[PDB]
Design a protein around this ligand. Structure first.
Ligand SMILES: *[C@@H]1O[C@H](CO)[C@@H](O[C@@H]2O[C@H](CO)[C@@H](O[C@@H]3O[C@H](CO[C@H]4O[C@H](CO)[C@@H](O)[C@H](O)[C@@H]4O)[C@@H](O)[C@H](O[C@H]4O[C@H](CO)[C@@H](O)[C@H](O)[C@@H]4O)[C@@H]3O)[C@H](O)[C@H]2NC(C)=O)[C@H](O)[C@H]1NC(C)=O
Ligand SMILES: *[C@@H]1O[C@H](CO)[C@@H](O[C@@H]2O[C@H](CO)[C@@H](O)[C@H](O)[C@H]2NC(C)=O)[C@H](O)[C@H]1NC(C)=O
Ligand SMILES: *[C@@H]1O[C@H](CO)[C@@H](O)[C@H](O)[C@H]1NC(C)=O
Ligand SMILES: *[C@@H]1O[C@H](CO)[C@@H](O)[C@H](O)[C@H]1NC(C)=O
Ligand SMILES: *[C@@H]1O[C@H](CO)[C@@H](O)[C@H](O)[C@H]1NC(C)=O
Ligand SMILES: *[C@@H]1O[C@H](CO)[C@@H](O)[C@H](O)[C@H]1NC(C)=O
Ligand SMILES: *[C@@H]1O[C@H](CO)[C@@H](O)[C@H](O)[C@H]1NC(C)=O
Ligand SMILES: *[C@@H]1O[C@H](CO)[C@@H](O)[C@H](O)[C@H]1NC(C)=O
Length: 268
């Protein structure tokens, strides 16, 4: 389980027939890199040490799409994952349509330790062009999940059950371009402070925020999304949420004559 609160008994089983899809990290076009502090480098190559993916390591696609039933096995290892120093995410923006109006969906991620309301859980959730980010003492469900608010779902949304508002260290919204095909994120921790970088356009990420927690984060989980759409019998659309571990690595970075990181090399 994530959490421990019994949010519902409705339509749960032990279905085993789901496996992690995997793909190979390739930073040669600047994927997995980020812009350095407030600096601009031009038409040059730099050696820099930062929280980066290992080149040639695997990404794991942790996105889960459901329709009605939830497997208990989705709420365990290998999906419930160790956070260590941090993670890099490559996220497909699943662009749906209703009456020729565009809607943007992708999986929520939660980052935490015990997921009990005596500890802070970070949550990053899309709301169709608004990225809502919070860090609160959420009463996380045993079996948390989200819904397609655009197309609808056979079950209600539930990932926490707080009746009164919980205590929060952080709560902000960031806009993102709903038309882009991919979002990139770095989430990492150093000396009890969490750091988030993202990009909605291009591959190199840029700083969103940092947050003092004092405590070590230890786990992350990508919430199942339940939808009446997003499948081969209705639209051929898919979720994808690729993650890979960060570590403190030395990279070569190449900046063009307008300060964009165009290429990188993991030196080991
Ligand atoms: C912070 O987060 C913690 C969890 O980490 C929350 O603590 C839980 O809170 C819930 C809701 O109050 C508790 O659930 C309720 O427990 C009652 C007592 O359980 C005993 O009695 C039942 C029989 O009634 C036995 O089966 C059981 O083994 C225990 O011996 C139950 O009486 C409640 O059931 C009633 O309400 C539900 C509501 O859905 C109905 O469906 C039932 O029919 C029935 O009417 C209910 O189960 C839970 O026990 C708490 N857990 C712990 C570990 O304390 C905190 O509430 C939360 N704090 C804040 C501020 O949000
Ligand atoms: C951040 O974005 C969220 C999601 O859009 C906003 O939450 C909604 O706010 C309206 C107006 O108060 C409510 O009617 C909705 O019920 C809220 N939830 C959802 C899921 O839409 C939120 O107001 C924004 N701002 C902040 C500071 O959180
Ligand atoms: C969860 O809640 C329902 C309704 O109260 C109950 O029937 C079910 O036995 C509960 N399961 C657990 C593990 O608490
Ligand atoms: C579930 O899948 C795992 C991993 O392949 C396997 O070890 C296990 O025996 C399976 N159990 C059932 C009942 O399918
Ligand atoms: C960029 O750097 C290369 C290598 O020094 C040089 O040949 C080129 O003229 C430079 N171009 C600009 C626009 O600075
Ligand atoms: C969803 O919420 C509505 C309104 O509270 C309720 O009527 C319905 O029974 C709920 N269904 C489930 C599966 O939770
Ligand atoms: C949004 O993304 C699309 C596709 O990448 C791009 O054509 C468009 O210019 C972007 N708009 C904004 C405001 O960034
Ligand atoms: C999904 O793609 C396949 C191959 O093109 C096609 O047979 C199928 O009908 C498509 N499904 C929908 C809902 O269009």
């Amino acid at each position: 389980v994530i959490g421990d609160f019994n949010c519902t008994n409705f339509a749960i089983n032990d279905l085993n027939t789901t496996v992690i899809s995997e793909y190979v990290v390739d930073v040669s076009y600047g994927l997995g890199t980020y812009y350095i502090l407030d600096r601009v480098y031009l038409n040059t190559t730099i050696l820099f040490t930062g929280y980066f993916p290992k080149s040639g390591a695997n990404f794991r696609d942790l996105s889960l799409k459901g329709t009605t039933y939830l497997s208990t096995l989705w709420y365990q290892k290998p999906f419930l994952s160790d956070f260590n120093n941090g993670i890099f995410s490559r996220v497909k923006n699943t662009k749906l349509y209703v009456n020729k109006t565009l809607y943007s969906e992708f999986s929520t991620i939660v980052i935490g330790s015990v997921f009990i309301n005596n500890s802070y859980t970070i949550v990053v959730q899309p709301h169709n062009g608004v990225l809502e980010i919070t860090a609160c003492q959420y009463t996380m469900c045993e079996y948390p999940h989200t819904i397609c608010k655009s197309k609808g779902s056979s079950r209600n949304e539930s990932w926490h059950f707080d009746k009164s508002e919980p205590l929060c260290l952080f709560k902000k919204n960031f806009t993102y371009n709903v038309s882009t095909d991919w979002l990139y994120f770095h989430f990492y921790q150093e000396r009890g402070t969490f750091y988030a970088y993202y990009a909605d356009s291009g591959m190199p990420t840029t700083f969103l925020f940092s947050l003092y927690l004092g405590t070590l984060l230890s786990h992350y989980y990508v919430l199942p999304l339940t939808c009446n759409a997003i499948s081969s019998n209705t639209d051929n659309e898919t979720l994808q949420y690729w993650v890979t571990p960060l570590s403190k690595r030395q990279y070569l970075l190449k900046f063009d004559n307008r300060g964009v990181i165009t290429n990188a090399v993991d030196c080991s």
